[PDB]
Amino acid sequence: EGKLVIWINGDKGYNGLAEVGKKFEQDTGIKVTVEHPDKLEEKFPQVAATGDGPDIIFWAHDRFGGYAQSGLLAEVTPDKAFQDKLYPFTWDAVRYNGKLIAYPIAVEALSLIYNKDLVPNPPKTWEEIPALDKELKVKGKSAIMFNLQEPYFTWPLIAADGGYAFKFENKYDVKDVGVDNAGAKAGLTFLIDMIKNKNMSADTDYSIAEAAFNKGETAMTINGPWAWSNIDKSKVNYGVTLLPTFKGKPSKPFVGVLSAGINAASPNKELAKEFLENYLLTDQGLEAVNKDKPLGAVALKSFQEQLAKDPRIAATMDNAQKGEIMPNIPQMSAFWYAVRTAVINAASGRQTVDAALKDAQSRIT
């Protein structure tokens, strides 16, 4: 009691958040400690269920319905004046069983990131990437590298031709899952065909793809706004644009709302409200985080007006509008775990595309 402990993922601007915390302490005398534990999103329900953990947890909104279902989150209590400061759809992302259970911070979607000096006119279709890779390979380069270990990054291609997570009835139907339909299989088959053709490697992860793109070894990558800061520091002149189409249809990235939840076991709920409402969710607070690692589009209207001019933010929102907001329902984690296994198994040859996605479908339903 009398201090704030915050958990936020290691790819976000946690040093910039810590600067917001130091301003909070200067004004209130209350120490703010920012940590970025690994697997924090799995650790939180295990320690919050024993009355331990951080006061505030940051994650995309898809994790928070499971937390709320287990009673681990405090209902947030912003007045109507504060609610009108943020975009209504961001509040929708953090509403569960009619109650607001987090503060929305930022809106994230994946984009195509490309090296302007290797591919001045980036490809508009996935289907043209193998021919581009062939020309780059004679120069000792590759067309594209992105994280193949996390299903977040492969989902936009799987969804393009018809894959989906849970069908929404304008409630989600947890038994109507689109992981093993013909569109999902077509997109995962194309990924596997690029791997078989040695346009990509099944073992490429986040670090490998980031290093290759930022050193100028691959012409393109797929990542979110948090990655731009490291590219700014690199020698690479990059642009951010629409994901390629597949079979003429847009890639459909899942849209995540970075959100801050207050632990139901926190003895500091009033302090957490003060910090999130009056320090973080201000133009100056978001700027401090954004200058560390870019947040993407932000939930705070006044600051989003200042970011909307950036072509990288414009591309982020264009991809977001072609994609889908993630469900926040507890079943979303089962979806992600099952799809992760399916993609890794198909990409590594441990299963066929059909057998992998059928098994995921059975697991989820």
Ligand X SMILES: OC[C@H]1O[C@H](O[C@H]2[C@H](O)[C@@H](O)[C@@H](O[C@H]3[C@H](O)[C@@H](O)[C@@H](O[C@H]4[C@H](O)[C@@H](O)[C@@H](O)O[C@@H]4CO)O[C@@H]3CO)O[C@@H]2CO)[C@H](O)[C@@H](O)[C@@H]1O
Q: Which residues contact 321 (CB under 8 A, 6 or more apart)?
A: none
Would you give the distance in Å from CA 362 to the centre of its chain?
25
d(CA 64, CA 327): 10
CB burial of residue 112 (10 Å; 0-12, 13-18, 19+): buried
| DSSP per position, 11-32 | TS-HHHHHHHHHHHHHHH---E
CB under 5 to 8 A by kind: which of ligand X, Mg ion, none does 36 bind?
none
Q: Is 103 in the site for ligand X (CB under 6 A)?
A: no
State the minimum distance, in angstroms, from the CB of residue 319 to Mg ion: 23
Task: List contacts with Mg ion (CB under 5 A).
Answer: 39, 75, 149
- Is residue 223 left, alpha or beta, with left meaning phi > 0 and alpha meaning psi from -120 to 50? beta
Q: Is 205 in the site for ligand X (CB under 6 A)?
A: no
Radius of gyration of the chain measured on its C-alpha atoms: 21
State the minimum distance, in angstroms, from the CB of residue 340 to Mg ion: 8
Would you give the distance in Å from CA 334 to the centre of its chain?
17
CB under 5 to 8 A by kind: which of Mg ion, ligand X, none does 161 bind?
none
CB under 5 to 8 A by kind: which of ligand X, Mg ion, none does 152 bind?
ligand X
CB 164 within 8 A of CB 324: yes
Q: Which amino acid, residue 313?
A: I
Q: Which amino acid, residue 176?
A: D
Of 118 and 329, CB closest to ligand X: 329
| DSSP per position, 168-229 | E---EEEEEEESSSHHHHHHHHHHHHHHHTTSS-TT--HHHHHHHHHTTSEEEEEE-GGGHH
Chain positions 145 to 174 lying near ligand X, rule: CB under 6 A, are: 150-152
State the minimum distance, in angstroms, from the CB of residue 94 to Mg ion: 11
d(CA 59, CA 263): 13
Shortest-Cβ-distance residue relative to Mg ion: 149
Binder to ligand X among 189, 229, 230, 333 (CB under 6 A)? 333
Of 136 and 222, CB closest to ligand X: 222
Q: Is 261 in the site for ligand X (CB under 6 A)?
A: no
Q: Is 340 in the site for ligand X (CB under 6 A)?
A: yes
Of 46 and 83, CB closest to ligand X: 46
CB under 5 to 8 A by kind: which of ligand X, Mg ion, none does 62 bind?
ligand X
Of 160 and 356, CB closest to Mg ion: 356
d(CA 62, CA 65): 7
Q: Is 63 in the site for ligand X (CB under 6 A)?
A: yes
State the minimum distance, in angstroms, from the CB of residue 99 to Mg ion: 5
Of 37 and 162, CB closest to Mg ion: 37
Coil, helix or strand at residue 123: coil
Of 90 and 149, CB closest to Mg ion: 149
CB burial of residue 320 (10 Å; 0-12, 13-18, 19+): buried
Q: How many CB atoms lie within 10 A of CB 102?
A: 32
- Report how many residues bind ligand X under the rule CB under 6 A: 18
Nearest to 158 by CA among 362, 353, 312, 319: 353
Chain positions 210 to 239 lying near ligand X, rule: CB under 6 A, are: 224
Q: Is 260 in the site for ligand X (CB under 6 A)?
A: no
Of 133 and 210, CB closest to Mg ion: 210
In 180-232, where do the E strands start and end?
Answer: 218-223
d(CA 300, CA 278): 12
What x-and-dash track marks residues 291-330 binding ligand X by CB under 6 A?
A: ----------------------------------------
Q: Is 180 in the site for ligand X (CB under 6 A)?
A: no
CB under 5 to 8 A by kind: which of ligand X, Mg ion, none does 340 bind?
ligand X
Q: Is 337 in the site for ligand X (CB under 6 A)?
A: yes
Q: Which residues bind ligand X (CB under 6 A)?
A: 9, 11, 39, 41-42, 60, 62-63, 108, 150-152, 224, 256, 333, 336-337, 340
